Amino acid sequence: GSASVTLLKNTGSLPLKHPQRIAVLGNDATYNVLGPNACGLANSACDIDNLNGTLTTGGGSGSALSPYTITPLEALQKRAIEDNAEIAAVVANSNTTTGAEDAIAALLPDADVTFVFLNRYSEEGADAPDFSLGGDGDNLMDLAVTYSSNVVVVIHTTGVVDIEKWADNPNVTAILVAYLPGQEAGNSLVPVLYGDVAPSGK
Amino acid sequence: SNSTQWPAPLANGGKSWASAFKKAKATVTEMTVEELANITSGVIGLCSGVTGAVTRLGIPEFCLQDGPIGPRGVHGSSQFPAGLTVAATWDRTLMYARARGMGQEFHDQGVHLALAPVTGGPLGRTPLNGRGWEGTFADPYACGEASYLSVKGLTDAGVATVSKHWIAYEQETSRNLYIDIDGVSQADIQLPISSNVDDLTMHELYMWSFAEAVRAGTNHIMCSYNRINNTHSCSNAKGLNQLLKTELNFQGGVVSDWGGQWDSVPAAENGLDVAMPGKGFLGALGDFWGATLVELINNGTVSEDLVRDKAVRILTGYYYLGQDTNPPPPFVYNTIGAPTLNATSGYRNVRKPGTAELIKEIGSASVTLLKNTGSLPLKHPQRIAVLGNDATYNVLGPNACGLANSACDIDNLNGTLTTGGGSGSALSPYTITPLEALQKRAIEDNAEIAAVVANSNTTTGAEDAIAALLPDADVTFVFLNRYSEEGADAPDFSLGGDGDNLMDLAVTYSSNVVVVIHTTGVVDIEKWADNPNVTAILVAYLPGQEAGNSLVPVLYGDVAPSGKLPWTWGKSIDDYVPNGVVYTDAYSPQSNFTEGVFIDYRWFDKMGITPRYEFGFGLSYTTFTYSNLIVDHGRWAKDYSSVMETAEPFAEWDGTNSLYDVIFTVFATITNTGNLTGSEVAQLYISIPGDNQPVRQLRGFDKIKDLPVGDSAVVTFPIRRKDVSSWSVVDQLWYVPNGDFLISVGGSSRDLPLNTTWTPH
Ligand SMILES: *[C@@H]1O[C@H](CO)[C@@H](O[C@@H]2O[C@H](CO)[C@@H](O[C@@H]3O[C@H](CO[C@H]4O[C@H](CO)[C@@H](O)[C@H](O[C@H]5O[C@H](CO)[C@@H](O)[C@H](O)[C@@H]5O)[C@@H]4O)[C@@H](O)[C@H](O[C@H]4O[C@H](CO)[C@@H](O)[C@H](O)[C@@H]4O[C@H]4O[C@H](CO)[C@@H](O)[C@H](O)[C@@H]4O)[C@@H]3O)[C@H](O)[C@H]2NC(C)=O)[C@H](O)[C@H]1NC(C)=O
Ligand SMILES: *[C@@H]1O[C@H](CO)[C@@H](O[C@@H]2O[C@H](CO)[C@@H](O[C@H]3O[C@H](CO)[C@@H](O)[C@H](O[C@H]4O[C@H](CO)[C@@H](O)[C@H](O)[C@@H]4O[C@H]4O[C@H](CO)[C@@H](O)[C@H](O)[C@@H]4O[C@H]4O[C@H](CO)[C@@H](O)[C@H](O)[C@@H]4O)[C@@H]3O)[C@H](O)[C@H]2NC(C)=O)[C@H](O)[C@H]1NC(C)=O
Ligand SMILES: *[C@@H]1O[C@H](CO)[C@@H](O[C@@H]2O[C@H](CO)[C@@H](O[C@H]3O[C@H](CO)[C@@H](O)[C@H](O)[C@@H]3O)[C@H](O)[C@H]2NC(C)=O)[C@H](O)[C@H]1NC(C)=O
Ligand SMILES: *[C@@H]1O[C@H](CO)[C@@H](O[C@@H]2O[C@H](CO)[C@@H](O)[C@H](O)[C@H]2NC(C)=O)[C@H](O)[C@H]1NC(C)=O
Ligand SMILES: *[C@@H]1O[C@H](CO)[C@@H](O)[C@H](O)[C@H]1NC(C)=O
Ligand SMILES: *[C@@H]1O[C@H](CO)[C@@H](O)[C@H](O)[C@H]1NC(C)=O
Ligand SMILES: *[C@@H]1O[C@H](CO)[C@@H](O)[C@H](O)[C@H]1NC(C)=O
Ligand SMILES: *[C@@H]1O[C@H](CO)[C@@H](O)[C@H](O)[C@H]1NC(C)=O
């Protein structure tokens, strides 16, 4: 994970120093709400709108079960606590959950950094129709750039996605792609974000 | 109502605030009328309330800030466990340290007056009370002890306390704070519930805790929203002028609850000293003093001296705590909220090293084991299932529900209930979720762990995920909660969100279900409490920010559970004091406290009703055997320790003595007779003789720490003169009655292996 996470954009926001107020966005930052193995033997049987959490692997016969997932939020919070900082995550569906937009609007302005975790599930037996982000990713980004000027994007994905609407936004200070990191998702990522190891994936 | 019958005595400064009073006189003596009205009424500011400055005389604005778990609406602080949770520790060291820590965060955030603690209002009379959780024990003695130490902690940090809510504030329904915006006035719709309380009940039940608060040196007291005998508490002359200011000899200021003042002139005469919020909250909650009191004084209705005594009471605390020569810093957060106040916020980090660890410790000292068939402590389980949104975060963030933890949608998944709703809440820098802490330990054991943390009823596939996960799990944890808030009482004991459904599913698919309850009060677990698939039940109350990491070490047996219930857990709401909350549309709603002193376990004991889990009940991973009860009448001692003195009359007074002298001490021995190290909260109950008297009253507790297997420890209970007395209605004084006092000692209110009789004069 640490050797592969790929830094695509950085205007000087990374590595992080010791930020004191940290905002997180996206269900990808936390657990599948039905459990890491809820989608079944092929990681492909959860409902179309289910919040699957961190995309640690793809769908179909080349997936596998997981004894746990070390979520980005957990790993970010651990480091926040070491710096005596505050951290808060909006991890619901930003379109369909009552109060989610307002919660994001109220959270992001005072944060020193805001992390948006995006994903794009794909699977055996079908091709992706386009490069569009999975779930509410488009809307998370739209909201993130509206309410914050230090947005750091992390993408867990099976392939290339469409970030054309935001990659040249002056409020997106950094972008990374972490691909499909397996069970150690958060703890492989956070040391790169905080500069313990320089990213080296390409 | 009658302030000729019940006149207002003048502040003199009492025992510890003599130099402070002297300074207060001097400064007040130089003030104009303009200036008396400025400090005696609230003004617009960033704090919950702000007094007007006396800026000619160098006297700044006092920040009055919520609440009883620490400064509310503030970033850069810690979320402490609620009062209910420290109560469950039965640990005086933790009660003090908790408040001392809140205290430093209050002072360092720039707060002069903390709107805290809750010191016996509500106490309380109903287990449905929305904000009962803000208090501590449902018992006058134990509430009294924790009240003393809470005020002491806050004052020792340099923050003045406003102990609340005086008095008989025992329901949120129809509390009816005064509002008067455009047309709609609360005066036109419904008066506040009237608590109608006899003289004995008021003395032996509700005043007890406030008497301890006064003795610890509360600088101020908040008068409550309810009426008493159909007169508002904030303008009750019997209440404020006589009972508090004469009999309790209270030398500090009475601060109105926000909308607790309804009159101008009765309030001024009958004991109120500060009008809040004043110009705050758009003047909407009444603005009955300010320029109106300026007019009332120099047209002859309200005495000038009377209003000078009010400002003296306010300023005493200022000088006593050294706020003149060691001022607190600027308060930098907008805690009111737009659109009511449009103002920006700065930032200040106030979290000290040690605070996080203390909060953790309070959680581990309070979590209360109610059922154990032998599944706990855990060994090294390899497949772990977790049920409940309470096991993880609020899906919108820890603070999503706003400045009072109460603005989230009715169906929002709020995560771990680490605190309650309302002005007693506080923001959180993070939450250490139960799931996070359980997973950390599972990973140490090379185990696997999966949580279903969605709403189990409304989320597609949630029920099927649960059914597929549970059968193969070695242990299944179910996390449940029940949010309640200020401004409404719970309708019943039912669990919040999907709690009932989670339990039905859990017992269907697993025969090793461990239940953990985060709650503001008693909940209904009757469907599942006797199901043998439920191998253990624990109540964790409201643990604050360190929820998960306080809990898991108990579950895994690094520390034995040690907390005990601070109220009674009855099988049904119908088993409690009747008319616990009165719902009516009648203009003048009435609550008659016809039960008298018999609330919580006193009611249960008198009516012969067995609770599921009694007052003072909690299991350990070991057992304690009691022996060798000793009453040492030679072990007496004069009351020197208190910060302030009351003037409570009593029969045995001779010039020398006090109602709070310790007149004997009782001792007992506990031996750890199980197979693991454990702490034990020993308890002492006394049956005071008399007519219509409680079967048992708590008069002592002592927590022995980490007693090894086979070892013994001596447990110690000082008994004050007041602890053995009754209030005489005829003679209007306390007295030690004649007859037989049974002194009972053991591990709970219904497990008392040791007893002896004491017969006085
Ligand atoms: C809300 O409402 C309630 C109900 O109205 C108020 O409760 C009342 O409170 C007052 C105190 O302000 C009590 O007054 C005292 O009453 C004494 C006599 O009591 C008997 O009176 C009637 C008989 O019809 C009954 O109400 C009482 O019955 C109740 O109590 C008994 C005993 O426990 C129970 O068994 C019953 O079931 C009832 O619950 C009594 O039978 C009276 O002696 C006393 O007078 C002394 O004190 C006053 C004030 O200091 C002096 O002015 C006066 O001169 C007397 O003092 C002299 O004598 C003594 C020695 O005897 C000396 O020590 C003194 O130096 C002095 O020389 C007083 O009038 C009233 O009884 C009580 N009622 C109830 C039902 O509780 C609440 O206060 C009120 N609360 C608020 C906040 O407003
Ligand atoms: C959490 O995780 C969940 C899983 O655990 C995620 O849910 C899954 O999400 C995926 C997409 O993200 C979803 O995919 C399928 O949805 C339906 C299901 O029935 C299908 O229609 C889709 O397949 C079609 O579309 C693809 C792109 O357009 C295409 O590559 C694919 O081959 C297929 O198209 C054929 O079918 C159409 C006929 O209706 C034709 O119009 C089309 O041209 C293609 O025709 C070919 O095949 C036909 C046979 O049917 C044949 O008639 C024709 O001749 C020709 O050969 C799509 O794969 C999963 O269903 C969904 N799983 C569940 C259980 O709902 C979830 O999204 C994730 N959450 C988040 C937030 O990301
Ligand atoms: C009656 O109460 C009023 C509100 O408390 C008070 O007005 C306030 O006076 C204080 C001075 O104590 C001012 O505070 C600040 O003033 C400047 C602002 O740049 C600072 O340099 C100072 O350090 C100080 O912090 C408030 O600005 C002022 N508030 C308002 C709304 O005017 C009255 O003066 C009081 N009146 C009397 C007669 O005592
Ligand atoms: C999560 O918290 C919210 C408040 O932040 C709860 O919503 C309130 O619930 C009470 C009943 O206890 C209602 O009378 C209020 O009107 C609700 N408030 C709002 C603004 O809707 C909510 O019930 C909690 N969620 C769960 C699952 O218990
Ligand atoms: C960048 O963020 C600020 C608020 O931080 C917002 O006002 C501005 O419109 C944003 N700009 C873009 C291009 O998203
Ligand atoms: C005194 O001033 C008050 C407040 O303005 C006013 O209501 C009252 O009528 C005045 N005169 C009296 C009571 O004689
Ligand atoms: C207890 O759990 C088992 C499955 O492990 C189930 O068959 C049984 O019906 C349950 N019993 C009760 C009384 O809930
Ligand atoms: C409350 O008190 C009096 C008895 O003194 C009684 O007349 C009144 O009706 C009572 N109210 C209710 C609702 O029972």
CATH number (domain holding residue B409):
3.40.50.1700
**Which residues of A fall below an 8 Å CB-CB distance to B?**
20-21, 30-31, 33-38, 46-47, 49-51, 67-68, 73-74, 77, 80-81, 84-92, 97-100, 103, 107, 110
The response to whether residue B36 sits with its C-beta less than 6 Å from ligand 3 reads no
Peptide-bond breaks in chain B following residues (C–N over 2.5 A) = none
Torsion sign over Cα B376, B381, B385, B389? positive
Residue B231 CA to ligand 1 center (angstroms) comes to: 18
* Cα-Cα end-to-end distance for chain B: 40
Contact B454 A91 (CB under 8 A): no
Closest to A51 in 3D by CA, of B121, B35, B455, B74: B455
Q: Tokens representing A196?
A: 């313990």
Distance CA B659, CA B542 (A): 35
Instruction: List, in order, residues 6 or more apart from B247 with CB less than 8 Å away.
Output: B646, B647, B648, B649
Distance CA A161, CA A130 (A): 8
| B451: closest CA of chain A, how far (Å) | 5
Helices (H) and strands (E) in chain B — how many of each? 17, 25
Residue closest by Cα to atom 7 of ligand 3:
B53
Contact A98 B411 (CB under 8 A): yes
Q: What 8-state DSSP symbol labels residue B228?
A: E
Helices (H) and strands (E) in chain A — how many of each? 4, 6
Distance CA B482, CA B670 (A): 36
Give, in degrees to the nearest 5, the angle at Cα A160 between A120 and A55: 30
Q: Where does residue A95 rank: exposed (0-12), middle (13-18), buried (19+ CB within 10 A)? A: middle
Q: Of the ligands numbered here, which is closest to the C-alpha atom of B42?
A: 3
Residue closest by Cα to atom 9 of ligand 6:
B296
A184 to chain B: closest CA residue: B443
> Reduced to 3 states, what is the DSSP secondary structure of residue B107?
helix
Contact list in A for residue B351 (CB cut-off 8 A) is 84
| A120: closest CA of chain B, how far (Å) | 20
Chains A–B, number of C-beta pairs less than 8 Å apart: 104
Contact list in A for residue B462 (CB cut-off 8 A) is 33-34
Q: What letter represents residue B107's amino acid?
A: H
**Peptide bond preceding B167 in cis form (omega within 30 of 0):** yes
Catalytic residue positions of B, numbered: 257
Neighbours of B371 (CB within 10 A): 19
What is the rounded (10 degree) CA torsion for B215, B221, B226, B229?
A: 50
* Cα-Cα end-to-end distance for chain A: 12
How do strand B63-65 and strand B160-166 relate by DSSP bridges? unpaired
Q: Which of B436, B450, B454 sits opposite A36 (nearest CB)?
A: B450
Query: Which domain, by its residues, includes B434?
Result: 355-575
Mutate to test the interface with A, among B347, B393, B435, B474 (most CBs of A within 10 A): B393
The response to whether residue B592 sits with its C-beta less than 6 Å from ligand 8 reads yes
Distance CA A127, CA B189 (A): 64
Contact list in B for residue A77 (CB cut-off 8 A) is 430, 436
| A202: closest CA of chain B, how far (Å) | 31
Q: How was this structure determined?
A: X-ray
The residues that bridge with A23 in the sheet, in sequence order, are: A88, A114
The residues that bridge with B255 in the sheet, in sequence order, are: B222, B274
Resolution in angstrom units? 2.4
Q: Of the ligands numbered here, which is closest to the C-alpha atom of B226?
A: 1
Contact list in B for residue A99 (CB cut-off 8 A) is 396, 400, 408-409, 412
Closest to B450 in 3D by CA, of B408, B399, B509, B391: B391
How do strand B697-707 and strand B712-720 relate by DSSP bridges? unpaired
The response to whether residue B572 sits with its C-beta less than 6 Å from ligand 8 reads no
Q: Which atom belonging to ligand 1 lies closest to the Cα atom of B691?
A: 35
Q: Which of A67, A80, A100 sits opposite B396 (nearest CB)?
A: A100
The response to whether residue A52 sits with its C-beta less than 6 Å from ligand 2 reads yes
Closest to B115 in 3D by CA, of B488, B430, B404: B404
Q: Tokens representing A9?
A: 């954009």
| B528: closest CA of chain A, how far (Å) | 23
**Peptide bond preceding B165 in cis form (omega within 30 of 0):** yes
What is the total count of domains within chain A? 1
Instruction: List, in order, residues 6 or more apart from A159 with CB less than 8 Å away.
Output: A120, A122, A128
Distance CA B618, CA B561 (A): 8
Contact A103 B442 (CB under 8 A): no
Q: Which of B397, B435, B465 sits opposite A88 (nearest CB)?
A: B397
| Phi-psi category of residue A150: left, alpha or beta, with phi > 0 → left and psi -120 to 50 → alpha | beta
Instruction: List, in order, residues 6 or more apart from B614 with CB less than 8 Å away.
Output: B565, B568, B569, B601, B604, B748, B749, B750, B751
B370 contacts B358 by C-beta, under 8 angstroms? no
Q: What 8-state DSSP symbol labels residue B42?
A: B
